[PDB]
Design a protein around this ligand. Sequence first.
Ligand SMILES: O=C(NCC(F)F)[C@H](Nc1ccc2c(c1)CNC2)c1cc(Cl)cc(C2CC2)c1
Lengths: 39, 156
Amino acid sequence: DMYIERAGDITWEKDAEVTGNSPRLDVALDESGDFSLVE
Amino acid sequence: GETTDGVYRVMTRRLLGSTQVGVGVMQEGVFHTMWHVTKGAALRSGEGRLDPYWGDVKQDLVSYCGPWKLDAAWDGLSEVQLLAVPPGERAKNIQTLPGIFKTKDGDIGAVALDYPAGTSGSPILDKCGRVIGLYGNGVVIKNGSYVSAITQGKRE
Ligand SMILES: O=C(NCC(F)F)[C@H](Nc1ccc2c(c1)CNC2)c1cc(Cl)cc(C2CC2)c1
């Protein structure tokens, strides 16, 4: 059996840690909700 | 039981000890998570029970207690925040500029951040604090890194 526990508020934090790249990827979505890379 | 708006952890006592399988968003009395996290099963909130209401394996989304309530969308230009809720760790806001998932049916936003599988369901926010989608369904690129789609449902 699964359960839920609160972890916080949904708010934008000004001055948060800014990391991460922005890639443009060609992908395919199958009937099972699984993404794959198209080449 | 707990009806408060906010971000929640989705836990299970089936494996060893307590394990975090995913994350979700409570909003307008509706709990929103990724389908692969709960597999549509009912959820406990202390003494209360949350029954699934809407679900779709292709979209990889599921709502509890009511229809999908999250409708905000990424504008294609602005940076966003991943309110990541990692297993055994505190909630953390990670600002990033999303990339793109190009599909035969259109383009989707994409956040390129690496987190354990139990982090799927974590909300992605805009400058107003509105949930524009959920992190936790994507792909693994050639360098082993994880890229997630900004998965958003449809409001009725
Ligand atoms: O997005 C995922 N896809 C597989 C992966 F190759 F990308 C993965 N969850 C997942 C699992 C089962 C299903 C679906 C999604 C949808 N249809 C069934 C995941 C999510 C996060 Cl946050 C992390 C990881 C780590 C391992 C990299 C994996």
